[PDB]
Paper text:
R pyocins, on the other hand, are related to the P2-like myophage ɸCTX, and contain rigid, contractile tails. Unlike T-even myophages, P2-like myophages and P2-like tailocin tail fibers consist of a single, large, trimeric tail fiber. Specifically, it is known that R1-subtype pyocins require the presence of common Pseudomonad outer core L-rhamnose to adsorb, whereas R2-subtype and R5-subtype pyocins require inferior outer core α or β-glucoses. From this alignment, we concluded that R pyocin tail fibers are composed of two regions (numbering relative to native [name]): a phage proximal region of high conservation (M1-A425) and a distal region of lower conservation (A426-R691).
A region of the R2-subtype pyocin tail fiber of [name], PAO1, spanning the distal region (R2-NTF; 32.2 kDa) was successfully cloned, recombinantly expressed with an N-terminal his-tag, and purified by Ni2+ immobilized metal affinity chromatography (Ni-IMAC). Crystal structures of the R2-NTF were solved by selenium single anomalous dispersion (Se-SAD) and molecular replacement (MR) using the Se-SAD structure as a search model. The overall structure of the trimeric R2-NTF is a barbell-like protein, with a three-domain organization consisting of a “head”, medial “shaft”, and “foot”. The head (G443-M525) and foot domains (P598-R691) are globular and connected by an intertwined, helical, and fibrous-looking shaft (W529-V597). The shaft domain has 8 aromatic (W529, F534, Y539, F545, W547, F557, H562, and H564) and 8 hydrophobic (L540, L550, P559, L569, L574, V581, I593, and A595) residues at the oligomeric interface. Of these, H562 and H564 form an H-x-H motif in octahedral coordination to a large divalent cation of ambiguous identity. In our R2-NTF Se-SAD solution, refinement of log-likelihood gain (LLG) maps revealed a peak at this location differing in displacement from Se-Met, but consistent with predicted scattering from iron series elements (i.e. Fe2+, Ni2+, or Zn2+). ICP-MS confirmed that these metals are associated with the R2-NTF. However, synchrotron fluorescence x-ray scans were unable to detect a strong peak for any single metal. Although we are currently unable to conclude which metal is present at this site, R2-NTF structures were deposited with Ni2+ bound at this position.
Residue numbers in the entry:
A (entry chain A), B (entry chain A), C (entry chain A): 443 to 691
The structure:
Amino acid sequence: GSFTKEADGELPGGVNLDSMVTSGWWSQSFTAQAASGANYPIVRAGLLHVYAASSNFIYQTYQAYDGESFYFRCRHSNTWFPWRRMWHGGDFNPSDYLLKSGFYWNALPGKPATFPPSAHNHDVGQLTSGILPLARGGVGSNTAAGARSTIGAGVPATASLGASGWWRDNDTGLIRQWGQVTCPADADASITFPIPFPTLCLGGYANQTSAFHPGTDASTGFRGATTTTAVIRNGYFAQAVLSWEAFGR
Amino acid sequence: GSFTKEADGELPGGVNLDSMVTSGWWSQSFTAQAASGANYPIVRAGLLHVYAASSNFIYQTYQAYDGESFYFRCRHSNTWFPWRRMWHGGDFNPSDYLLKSGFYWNALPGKPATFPPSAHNHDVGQLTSGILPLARGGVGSNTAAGARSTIGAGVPATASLGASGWWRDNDTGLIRQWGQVTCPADADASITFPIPFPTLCLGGYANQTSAFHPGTDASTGFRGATTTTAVIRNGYFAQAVLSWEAFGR
Amino acid sequence: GSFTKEADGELPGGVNLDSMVTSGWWSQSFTAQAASGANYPIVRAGLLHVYAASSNFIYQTYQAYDGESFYFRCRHSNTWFPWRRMWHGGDFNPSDYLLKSGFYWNALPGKPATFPPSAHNHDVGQLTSGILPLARGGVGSNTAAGARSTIGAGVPATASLGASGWWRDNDTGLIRQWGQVTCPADADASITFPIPFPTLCLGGYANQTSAFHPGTDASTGFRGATTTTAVIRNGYFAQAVLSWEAFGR
Ligand code: NI
């Protein structure tokens, strides 16, 4: 015979599609009747074609009535290969899926603005704001005086330690000064301090530097100090060199 | 004729599928015979259908016997379009591939816990533990005394630089004090230091502040110091004001 | 009838494929004639097959002449399901798309070398280079003397504050020393300073520690100092203990 414009028949229930082995075409009108059969490619009413090319090659196709898909298989040397299920547009759209050409860092969406960093070091120069406190090994200030205050440090004394000269505690302002003067016998001599006392001479004394004669007086006196001068008085009966110190601020 | 339930024939070797141009259907039973032909869509035994719609349109389909796939093409105006190879479930599964809807930061697996950071700065306040050592510009301690120790600094001297007063080196404890006293002629006067020496008066001296008469004695003496008092002795034959200094700790 | 090796006919323009409802096969030779019809699965010349299985099931297939694709649909209970468009190799290649198995951190290309970090803290020990300046709470140096210089600090005075002893300002080198000596009547006694003056004795004085007799002389003198010794002179007519101070550097 031939493939006729009328189907060869309706497939009932309980048909083994393996038994459909002469050429033709058959209609399964009921999904439920596909359910009660065997080797249907899908439980779905559908159209089956058989092409019995030879005893060793029986081809089949299956078109599901609702377009679930289209199926084909072949029996070769008394074994049925598995059905193939066509992919079609009702299954997926390729434009829904990620191309390899669009898989890179910049394209990845939802990337964080910043990232939790791992352990690392710094050069001190990357510290660009703030003031390190004492509790972290800092001096708690950006000024010299403030740093000293945080750690309780004084400032350096200054001095000029010459044969005549001065020394100054700059924490408090105290100044100490010294020198020598030649005094006339039983009389006064004026001295001029190496530097002026900024506000006030507080005290002083004079010392006989000579091997003054025993049994004679060799008294001394420091008096009448200004910011720049004082008066040294010599009790020895002869001209003598007296040394002196003075202090103030 | 018509499409018969028996195939029109078996395809041998060396068939050019371009020559298959009258309507019907033909079986290729041997992959090796497909190999020795031309314009097979795949080297595979299979079923070929020809639909010679007209001289200008010859359609063909090819079903591979092992389900490798299903193929179709058409000859239009004496040119054969290329075969189309159907995609089917034995080729790939779409659920194996990444959807664009699942391509975002949180979904990306294997992301590191932390990330190597790039160059950046800090405010000193983000330093929240540790003690900066001297080798990095720190003071190597969280205490004032420890900081001073790291850099070798002394503490401030204190003082009260009044007409009578005191000065104190707080590095060592040394205290220096001064004042004036009115002494009776050829006799002693007691002085009370501006502040007490914490443990010990170490020394002192007295100075005649007056223009004492020449040829008379104007000796002085500092003796008998406690922590709070001393005795100033006046050798001048008249009442006189003597100044004094004392030191201790 | 039967499916004949000659097509049932050529489809002209204006054909509604819904009306193609008796079994057979038909050729559309002109895309433009597909354009002027209805329910073509694609505007393309092509081959249409009809399988009228029953009044309730009319199946159709459509092969586009240029291989645009292959289409199928079915009329079930007087309603046409939509055409299915086969996916085929001319549409996409699955190996162009990203597998889920290749979607992980290391595979993502174009990842940055480093990443902008988010807010975070540090232990001071991760500061491993540089010298913190004063403007950031540092001492601007890795040396003790340099740190002192940045903040303007002095060094500690040293001393030995015994009954005889010394005190030294290490900012300037000034040394002050003191002690007592027993002097013979109207004569000299040598003293040896508690420590040597490194270069120079600058001055000194002596003080009578005794309740010297009034009306007698009790002058004193400090003279002839070296780096290690000086001479104390006693004007009192009796043996006496004199105290002294000396200063230098
Ligand atoms: Ni950092």
